[PDB]
From Swiss-Prot, chain F:
The lineage of its organism: Eukaryota, Metazoa, Chordata, Craniata, Vertebrata. Belongs to the nucleoporin Nup85 family. Component of the nuclear pore complex (NPC) that seems to be required for NPC assembly and maintenance. Involved in nephrogenesis. It comes from Xenopus laevis. Component of the nuclear pore complex (NPC). This is Nuclear pore complex protein Nup85. It comes from the Eukaryota. It is found in: Nucleus, Nuclear pore complex; Nucleus membrane. The chain holds residues 219 to 436 of 653 of the full protein.
């Protein structure tokens, strides 16, 4: 179904490219799905790379400090992460409890927008 | 802040300064009134999907709008020379935000603040949204904009008529008291606030009705009526309405004189009840100098639900005296408002009888007695007059049969018994107007009696 | 000064002020007020002590307000009878029927010139310093609000005629003293 | 992949996309330099880390079940993420239907 | 119990076979429809427009493609760096779980943002439909009032 | 008065131009009156064009076509307008009654885009003006310090931003306090000369840090 929608959009844009009004349409439109999803994927990859390299640098600095301590003082300990794990669990629980009303609202909108005809007909596009 | 705003709006110079600065324009351009969860343009269709906010969204929005409506009504009442432009911008803001206004007018509950908000909205509509106001001022500033103005005014008038038909029952008071009675001790103050809100609604209604008769000062030979000859509305309203949903009368036929008769009877009964309660309170205040300690403690407990038993005897006496003075003042205000509303209802009944006599009664005959259709001293017109065939204008004006008008007159004469006559006599003896419009109480009474006991030709 | 603040805090929210007769109560309150006004006229604060002395002024104003409020009440309503009170200083004698004679005596026991000089010293102490910041100005305005509560009465927002209106504690009737003080 | 050579004339949001792409390009160059230096740092310090000692990462030693509980919670959170992605896909599919 | 289980399994397998046959037919139809479109896009890609905005958009798209390629390459580099550094922290809860925790936290934040955006779009569409219905009802009420007057 | 076939045309044009909104003040700043005046002006222009009192003449027809709000006509008649800011203000005057700061940057960007498309070339001052229209004081002063080497201009801009009571940066992207660095740079540039060294004294006194040692060394 995704490929069908993609080829439909491809045919639509190929037919619209040969129209003179498409220039003014694009000039007046403040958004575009292609550029939107492109910048979305770009920002997602950028944030992933940023947090990954930040945590990698932090882990490398901690390992270097631990190695220096074990080479100088010949002893050392490691701080636990139980508090951090509990904080992460609480944050995940709070985010899921905030997302549950969003899911409820999305389900209500999908059921009220007269889009349940397909579910009633059991996967029938006609 | 809202207290300081009320203070600076109470004065005339402060109101002029606020109107010159532009407080209504600022309230209209404010961002807190844009994202509203109230949207309903009279029709059945209309909703709003607002994000997750603080609990009670519509209630909090009404509470935030309350000071704005309060200061707007205050400046509209205390305006000097800029009252025309003040009402103009107020009506413009009401039309721009007619979604939330109509939503609030259509959504009513049995709480405390909802009735006050509805009363304030009805008063603002009656003070700055009238067909006579539109015909007087702003008539030369885009009639299409004025067309939408009178359309929204008619919608607001329909909403006000629905609210009046819903809250016009005497049993509605005790029906709504149980919904907001937090405690049996504060139930007295709760029912007092409920009856005060009902009297304020009726005061806004009578002000809207009298806004057309005040201009007709040099001449008092005009009729303003548009009802139907059927007194069954009184029996239909004497039953039990619903103050939680939407109870609208058949708009395809307009209300009738039965609603007015029911309102007058309920107002007279409430006037007698309030007079008896005021006499009892006056007796209690006169005999409070020798009241028992248990009695003054019970009085303090009925005044406030807080355990006021460890205070002194002088403190208990002072609290009881303050409660009695407050009750006496409230009862006096209620009696004055009831007398004024009864006088306005007498005006309405007299003008309706004059309309039925020299305007329209039977549509199956083109009699010369049913001539003219001017409403008020100004040049006002009306559609049609008498239609021998079935027409929708006959549903707005009188019926096409004389038997209906005869039955209405007979039912009115039967309802106008000795009890109602004595009630009206006591009311006119204890109250004699409050404004400047020439004493016409006895004239109105005798004209109503004559037009009710006579038949139409 | 911290000991004085603890003392006034204990007087405010720890102990009541209704044991000795109301006449002696008002006399001691007025004497202390005149003494502290002479002190603040002779200056006591500089820059860091201004919030503390302003809080002390607020607390003593609250004490005076509580004393004025308690002067009107009576224990078992026994000595609040008769008319024409004989306890005055500058204001004329007031009469009231049984039940309000105690209130009239508590209202007439306040000195017109006393309140005048009290407000004058308060305004002078307010206008003297120029470095009083947020806390100092807030405490001074709270003291002035307590003084206005003692004098007139507070109100409440409304739309027509639904404001908090209290009798006696007002500014009407020129034959009394509230109108003269307001003028 | 071949459509990125067409679409004539920019749009209202195309300049914002261009400036965001320039910011992402400079940030990517900075992060690439950082990765290039971090790779050399790790290649130089790995021998020292292997010759020295290795720290521990097993948290919550007094409770032997808290570790597996947190692991199962993280796995269930990932499963919830996957299920929410699938639900969003189904929602947009039903909308396009 | 075994007989009931095998009967249910056979029924489900027949239903799945029918569904897979339908899916294969749909995929064959999609392939037959896409085969003539693979040559139309190749011919349209050669049409390079010469303008101050067309060349600008082309350069922007080329820069975006290069950025995506470099980001994927350096992300694979970071992934192999993490898989090599996993042996440095030694044994633990999940071999240095801080990276996975940060990754799932960022993923859940982005999912919440996408859910909020989709809900806002759906609410805007519902509000537009409701406004259209309100306008239609207002026009009908105005017509009814005109016919009544 | 000169042309015999334009009396009523100019009369209609003057009657239409009387509906221009010159910032009405009916108590406070109200945009409703401006929008109503713009709508009335547009309606009167359309009514005149449909009736014919504003047609059948090439000059006035081109004038009306320009006033309606087009892009190719202005790109052709670019000899009248100045540059991208003139194009933007012309668009904002002949297309909308008033604009908001949330759309002003979008309109300026679109104006610069179509101006560059209609036979033009990029320019550093044009990019600086586009950044100033896109706001962000930190990044615009960064671009100013990068491009222009005038330290006095950046000092005046920072002083104006501090006078406007806005959140400013306390570091020069390397050290601390940009105004002190700008004053030191100007003092060095002035001492590079062989005359006039009186302003440097007060500019060093204004800096209660490195200014003392800088003056003692100079």
């Amino acid at each position: 179904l995704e490929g069908f929608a993609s080829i439909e959009d491809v045919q639509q844009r190929n037919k619209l490219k040969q129209d003179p009004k498409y220039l003014q349409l694009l000039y007046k439109k403040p958004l575009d799905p292609k550029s939107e999803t492109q910048m979305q994927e770009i920002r997602r990859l950028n944030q992933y790379v940023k947090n990954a390299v930040q945590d990698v640098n932090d882990v490398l600095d901690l390992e270097w400090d631990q190695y220096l301590e074990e080479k100088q003082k010949k002893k050392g300990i490691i701080i636990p992460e139980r508090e951090t794990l509990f904080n992460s669990l609480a944050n995940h629980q709070e985010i899921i409890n905030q997302q549950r009303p969003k899911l409820e609202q999305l389900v209500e909108n999908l059921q009220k927008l007269r889009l349940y005809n397909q579910i009633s007909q059991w996967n029938v596009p006609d | 802040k809202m207290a300081f705003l009320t203070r600076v709006a109470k004065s005339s110079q402060g109101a002029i300064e606020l109107l010159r600065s532009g407080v209504i324009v600022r309230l209209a351009q404010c961002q807190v009134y844009d994202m509203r969860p109230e949207t309903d343009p009279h029709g059945v269709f209309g909703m709003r999907e607002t994000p997750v906010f603080i609990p009670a969204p519509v209630e909090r929005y009404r509470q935030i709008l309350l000071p704005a409506l309060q200061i707007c009504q205050l400046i509209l009442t205390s305006s000097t020379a800029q009252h025309l432009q003040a009402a103009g911008q107020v009506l413009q803001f009401l039309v721009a935000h007619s979604d939330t206004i109509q939503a609030i007018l259509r959504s009513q509950e049995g709480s405390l603040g909802s009735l006050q908000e509805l009363a304030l909205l009805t008063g603002i509509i009656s003070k700055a949204a009238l067909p006579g106001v539109l015909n007087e001022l702003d008539i030369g500033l885009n009639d299409g904009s004025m067309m939408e103005l009178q359309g929204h005014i008619g919608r607001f008038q329909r909403q006000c008529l629905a609210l009046l038909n819903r809250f016009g029952g005497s049993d509605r008071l005790r029906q709504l008291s149980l919904q907001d009675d937090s405690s049996r001790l504060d139930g007295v103050s709760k029912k007092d606030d409920m009856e005060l809100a009902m009297q304020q609604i009726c005061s806004n209604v009578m002000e809207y009705c009298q806004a057309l008769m005040i201009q007709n000062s040099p001449s008092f030979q005009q009729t303003v009526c548009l009802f139907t000859p059927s007194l069954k509305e009184s029996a239909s309203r004497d039953g039990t309405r619903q103050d939680s949903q939407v109870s609208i009368l058949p708009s395809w036929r307009l209300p009738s004189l039965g609603v007015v008769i029911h309102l007058l009877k309920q107002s007279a009964n409430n006037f007698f009840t309030y007079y008896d309660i005021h006499r009892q309170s006056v007796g209690k205040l006169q005999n409070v100098e020798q009241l028992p300690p248990d009695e003054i403690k019970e009085l303090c407990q009925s005044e406030m639900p807080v355990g006021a038993d460890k205070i002194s005897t002088t403190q208990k006496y002072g609290l009881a005296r303050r409660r009695l003075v407050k009750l006496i003042n409230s009862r006096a205000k209620l009696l004055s408002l009831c007398s004024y509303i009864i006088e306005t209802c007498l005006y309405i009944l007299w003008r309706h009888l004059e309309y039925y006599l020299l305007h329209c009664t039977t549509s199956d005959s083109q009699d010369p007695v049913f001539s003219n259709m001017t409403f008020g001293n100004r040049r006002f017109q009306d559609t049609f007059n008498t239609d021998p065939n079935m027409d929708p204008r006959n549903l707005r004006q009188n019926k096409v049969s004389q038997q209906d008008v005869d039955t209405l007159l007979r039912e009115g004469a039967n309802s106008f018994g000795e009890s109602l006559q004595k009630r009206l006599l006591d009311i006119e003896s204890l109250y004699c107007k409050v404004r400047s419009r020439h004493s016409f109480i006895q004239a109105l009474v005798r004209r109503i009696r004559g037009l009710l006991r006579v038949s139409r030709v | 000064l911290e000991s004085w603040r603890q003392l006034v805090e204990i007087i405010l929210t720890a102990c009541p002020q209704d044991l000795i007769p109301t006449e002696h109560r008002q006399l001691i309150i007025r004497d202390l007020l005149q003494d502290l006004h002479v002190k603040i006229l002779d200056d006591d604060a500089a820059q860091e002590l201004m919030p503390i002395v302003a809080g002390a002024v607020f607390t003593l104003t609250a004490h005076l307000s509580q004393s004025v409020r308690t002067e009107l009440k009576q224990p078992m309503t026994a000595s609040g009878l008769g008319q024409s009170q004989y306890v005055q200083m500058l204001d004329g004698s007031f009469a009231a029927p049984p039940g309000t004679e105690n209130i009239s005596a508590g209202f007439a026991s306040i000195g017109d010139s006393s309140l005048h000089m009290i407000l004058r010293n308060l305004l002078e102490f307010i206008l003297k310093t120029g470095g009083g910041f947020q806390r100092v100005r807030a405490h001074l305005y709270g003291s002035l609000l307590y003084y206005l509560q003692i004098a007139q009465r507070p109100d409440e927002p409304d739309t027509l005629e639904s404001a908090h209106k209290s009798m006696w504690e007002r500014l009407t009737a020129p034959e009394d003293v509230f109108s003269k003080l307001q003028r | 992949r071949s459509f990125h050579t067409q679409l004539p004339v920019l749009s209202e949001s195309e300049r914002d996309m261009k400036k965001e792409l320039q910011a992402t390009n400079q940030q990517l160059q900075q992060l690439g330099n950082s990765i290039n230096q971090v790779n050399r740092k790790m290649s130089y310090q790995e021998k020292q880390m292997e010759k020295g000692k290795s720290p521990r990462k097993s948290s919550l030693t007094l409770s032997d079940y808290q570790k597996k509980n947190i692991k199962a919670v993280l796995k269930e959170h990932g499963e919830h993420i996957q299920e929410m992605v699938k639900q969003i896909n189904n929602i947009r599919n039903h909308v396009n239907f | 119990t075994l007989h009931r289980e095998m009967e249910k399994v056979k029924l489900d397998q027949k239903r799945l076979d029918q569904e897979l046959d339908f899916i294969l037919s749909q995929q064959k139809e999609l392939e037959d429809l896409l085969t003539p479109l693979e040559e139309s896009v190749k011919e349209q890609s050669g049409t390079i427009y010469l303008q101050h905005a067309d060349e600008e958009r082309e350069k922007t798209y080329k820069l975006a493609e290069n950025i995506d390629a470099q980001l994927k390459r350096m992300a694979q580099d970071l992934k192999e760096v993490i898989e090599h550094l996993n042996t440095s922290a030694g044994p633990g809860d999940a071999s240095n779980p801080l990276q996975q925790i940060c990754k799932i936290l960022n993923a859940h934040m982005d999912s919440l943002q996408w859910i909020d955006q989709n809900s806002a779009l759906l609410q805007r569409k519902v509000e537009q439909v409701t406004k259209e219905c309100e306008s239609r009802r207002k026009e009908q009420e105005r017509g009814f009032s005109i016919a009544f007057d | 008065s000169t042309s015999a076939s334009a009396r009523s045309m100019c009369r209609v044009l003057d009657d239409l131009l009387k509906k221009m909104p010159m910032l009405h003040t009916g108590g406070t700043q109200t945009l409703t009156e401006f929008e109503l005046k713009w709508q009335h002006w547009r309606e009167e222009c359309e009514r005149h064009l449909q009736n014919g009192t504003f047609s059948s003449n090439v000059h006035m027809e081109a004038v009306c076509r320009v006033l309606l709000g087009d892009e190719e006509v202005l790109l052709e008649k670019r000899d009248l307008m100045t540059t991208w800011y003139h194009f933007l203000v012309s668009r904002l005057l002949f297309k909308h009654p008033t604009v908001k700061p949330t759309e002003l940057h979008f309109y300026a960007q679109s104006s610069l885009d179509m101006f560059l498309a209609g036979d033009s070339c990029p320019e550093p001052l044009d990019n600086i003006l586009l950044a100033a229209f896109e706001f962000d004081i930190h990044q615009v002063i960064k671009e100013f310090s990068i491009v222009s080497s005038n330290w006095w201009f950046v000092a005046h801009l920072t002083d104006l931003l501090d006078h406007c009571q806005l959140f400013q940066a306390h570091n020069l992207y390397f050290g601390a306090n940009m105004r002190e660095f700008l004053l030191l740079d100007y003092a060095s540039g002035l001492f590079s000369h062989h005359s006039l060294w009186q302003l440097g004294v007060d500019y060093f006194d204004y800096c209660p840090n490195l200014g003392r040692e800088y003056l003692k060394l100079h």
